[PDB]
Nucleic acid binder design. Structure first.
Ligand SMILES: [Mg+2]
Ligand SMILES: [Mg+2]
Ligand SMILES: [Mg+2]
Ligand SMILES: [Mg+2]
Ligand SMILES: [Mg+2]
Ligand SMILES: [Mg+2]
Ligand SMILES: [Mg+2]
Ligand SMILES: [Mg+2]
Ligand SMILES: [Mg+2]
Ligand SMILES: [Mg+2]
Ligand SMILES: [Mg+2]
Ligand SMILES: [Mg+2]
Ligand SMILES: [Mg+2]
Ligand SMILES: [Mg+2]
Ligand SMILES: [Mg+2]
Ligand SMILES: [Mg+2]
Ligand SMILES: [Mg+2]
Ligand SMILES: [Mg+2]
Ligand SMILES: [Mg+2]
Ligand SMILES: [Mg+2]
Ligand SMILES: [Mg+2]
Ligand SMILES: [Mg+2]
Ligand SMILES: [Mg+2]
Ligand SMILES: [Mg+2]
Ligand SMILES: [Mg+2]
Ligand SMILES: [Mg+2]
Ligand SMILES: [Mg+2]
Ligand SMILES: [Mg+2]
Ligand SMILES: [Mg+2]
Ligand SMILES: [Mg+2]
Ligand SMILES: [Mg+2]
Ligand SMILES: [Mg+2]
Ligand SMILES: [Mg+2]
Ligand SMILES: [Mg+2]
Ligand SMILES: [Mg+2]
Ligand SMILES: [Mg+2]
Ligand SMILES: [Mg+2]
Ligand SMILES: [Mg+2]
Ligand SMILES: [Mg+2]
Ligand SMILES: [Mg+2]
Ligand SMILES: [Mg+2]
Lengths: 87, 70, 116, 101
RNA sequence: GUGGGAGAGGGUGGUGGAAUUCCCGGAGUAGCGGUGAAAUGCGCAGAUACCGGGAGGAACGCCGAUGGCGAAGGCAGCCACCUGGUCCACCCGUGACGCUGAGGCGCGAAAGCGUGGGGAGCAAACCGGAUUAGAUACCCGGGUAGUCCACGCCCUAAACGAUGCGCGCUAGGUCUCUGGGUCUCCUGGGGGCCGAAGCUAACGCGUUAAGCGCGCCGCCUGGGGAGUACGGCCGCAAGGC
């Protein structure tokens, strides 16, 4: 799955500063990893429909945070998207 | 009548391998007793059910037995 | 022509009939009777009187082969399932033990419309 | 790597030539799948609750290991291959939940 | 975020015993079955009942609950892998990023359809036997599609809590599941029962609102005609909106 080892590796990479656990950049980073953990789980197991629902809620939440970042500071949005290869 | 947990020690509820204690929770048949006769709690009985089923597959507890009466 | 003198007796009691088989301790039968072996023909077979007479017919048949000790096995519920047991203890055959082995499935086969 | 428990019941009629073979075969299968064995308990001749393979008894083994998770079901497949091997039950380890404590 | 927690949540593979059917052998005579009674049916080519061995498919007894999970449909052997939702303790982080939601898209019991399998039990149609005034039925014996699996359609329902979602507020008592806690109890989050104020036409609802409010969507305007006609979109068709 997703262990706390791999978890901290992402938080410290996208932290705006030491100790930051809840920045918009960090949330989108964390959300996007479970996106890829699930989308690669759904390439196989195409008949797993109940897990398909949780994926739609993660994308909606990821785009909800990105649409917010767009409005406040558009630069860090581009620095984030280019760093995650989205859109 | 007495209840099983009442007359018993401090035991591992997740140990499927201890037949001696698991034989106490089976009836005359291989059936699993209701909570009323075991004196267990909600979460306890749910663990016992699964651990007995484990012992059944290992051939340690019987699936069913024969009643000697009537 | 066997001289068994000990063995098992299976009572298969249904609501339409009660039937008794007498076997040796290995399970292989010796003689047997039922509600139809005695004169009864129709619904009269699943009655406690027929169950009693069928049990006692097999018992006397087992006396020919010399049965004395008898272990009793019972399968199914039916009118006269108990009247067959009671008939067997007083049949002269010393009854060793009585066991109920009625097979109960683990919900594996779909029953007929009657049973649902 | 998570921690598991292995239960193996085999035919309780083996001499030492076949018993050592069957078990060192199990050792060989654990090596090939990366099972770090933490401890072992051997019960052996034990009265079964119902006939298994027409035999009223079974020879019991128990191993506690730590191995990668993805390889478990292929390890279970590798153990039931042996004819003498009859029962193979692999359970993820759990805490000894106490009752009437 | 961190640390814990419960679960028939899902998918994949694997696997265990009970039972039915069928085959093989042993043993064993004269009927079994079935009903309010019976008859078709099966049985001397030896059935039923008993023991043993084997095959196959489907469903998981007890635990099991007025219980749990899920958005709804719905989800019960056990094991493992992948995996989703959710809840609690800390008061750590971002700093209104929120709610609803016409379209769209995805899910959607059962039945039905296509291709290929599978086929034990059950069983529309149908073949029989009875009952009857008649039996195109209930009861009985057989029995195909189908039920199961894979892949693709179909989009209906008493899809029910006949109660859309989210939030705030408004006496309690009691039963319960699961967490935490200074663990007669307190404190949360669900699942039940009584009931304050109040609402309601009444039955009844009543911190899980049908109460007091607020935001947004869906929908209603007499019955039959009629969920029919026409048109359109969708569908292989049945037919659906
Ligand atoms: Mg009769
Ligand atoms: Mg084997
Ligand atoms: Mg599950
Ligand atoms: Mg599953
Ligand atoms: Mg034969
Ligand atoms: Mg005849
Ligand atoms: Mg004939
Ligand atoms: Mg004939
Ligand atoms: Mg003939
Ligand atoms: Mg076949
Ligand atoms: Mg029940
Ligand atoms: Mg719920
Ligand atoms: Mg329902
Ligand atoms: Mg989980
Ligand atoms: Mg703070
Ligand atoms: Mg702060
Ligand atoms: Mg600040
Ligand atoms: Mg929403
Ligand atoms: Mg919509
Ligand atoms: Mg559907
Ligand atoms: Mg279907
Ligand atoms: Mg089909
Ligand atoms: Mg039938
Ligand atoms: Mg029929
Ligand atoms: Mg009439
Ligand atoms: Mg007629
Ligand atoms: Mg209405
Ligand atoms: Mg409203
Ligand atoms: Mg507590
Ligand atoms: Mg509550
Ligand atoms: Mg009032
Ligand atoms: Mg009420
Ligand atoms: Mg409310
Ligand atoms: Mg109203
Ligand atoms: Mg309308
Ligand atoms: Mg009108
Ligand atoms: Mg219609
Ligand atoms: Mg028109
Ligand atoms: Mg049309
Ligand atoms: Mg067309
Ligand atoms: Mg229609």
């Amino acid at each position: 799955p997703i262990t706390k080892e791999e978890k901290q590796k992402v938080i410290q990479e996208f932290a705006r500063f030491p100790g930051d656990t809840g920045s918009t950049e960090v949330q989108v980073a964390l959300l996007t990893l479970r996106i890829n953990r699930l989308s690669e789980h759904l390439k196989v197991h195409k008949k797993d429909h109940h897990s398909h629902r949780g994926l739609l809620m993660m994308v909606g939440q990821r785009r909800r945070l990105l649409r917010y970042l767009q409005r406040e500071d558009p630069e860090r949005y581009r620095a984030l998207i280019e760093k995650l290869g989205i859109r | 009548k007495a209840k099983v947990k009442a007359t018993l020690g401090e035991f591992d509820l997740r140990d499927y391998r201890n037949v001696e204690v698991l034989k106490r929770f089976l009836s005359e048949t291989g059936k699993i007793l209701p909570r009323r006769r075991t004196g267990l709690s909600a979460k306890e009985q749910r663990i016992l059910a699964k651990t007995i089923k484990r012992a059944r597959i290992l051939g340690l507890l019987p699936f069913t037995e024969k009643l000697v009466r009537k | 022509k066997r001289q068994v003198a000990s063995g098992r007796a299976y009572i298969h009691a249904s609501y339409n009939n009660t039937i008794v088989t007498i076997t040796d301790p290995d399970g292989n039968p010796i003689t047997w009777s039922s509600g139809g072996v005695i004169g009864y023909k129709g619904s009269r077979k699943g009655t406690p009187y027929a169950a009693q007479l069928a049990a006692l017919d097999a018992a006397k048949k087992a006396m020919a082969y010399g049965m004395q000790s008898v272990d009793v096995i019972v399968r199914g519920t039916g009118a006269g399932r108990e009247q067959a047991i009671r008939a067997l203890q007083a049949s002269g055959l010393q009854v060793k033990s009585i066991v109920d082995d009625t097979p109960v499935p683990h919900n594996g086969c779909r029953p007929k419309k009657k049973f649902r | 790597m998570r921690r598991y428990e292995v239960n193996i019941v085999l035919n309780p009629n083996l001499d030492q030539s076949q018993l050592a073979l069957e078990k060192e075969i199990i050792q060989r299968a654990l090596e090939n799948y990366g099972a770090r064995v933490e401890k072992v308990e051997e019960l052996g001749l034990r009265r079964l609750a119902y006939p298994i393979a027409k035999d009223p008894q079974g020879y019991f083994l128990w191993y506690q290991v730590e191995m990668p998770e993805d390889r478990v079901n292929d390890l279970a497949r590798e153990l039931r291959i042996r004819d003498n091997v009859r029962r193979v039950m692999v359970v993820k380890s759990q805490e000894p939940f106490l009752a009437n404590a």
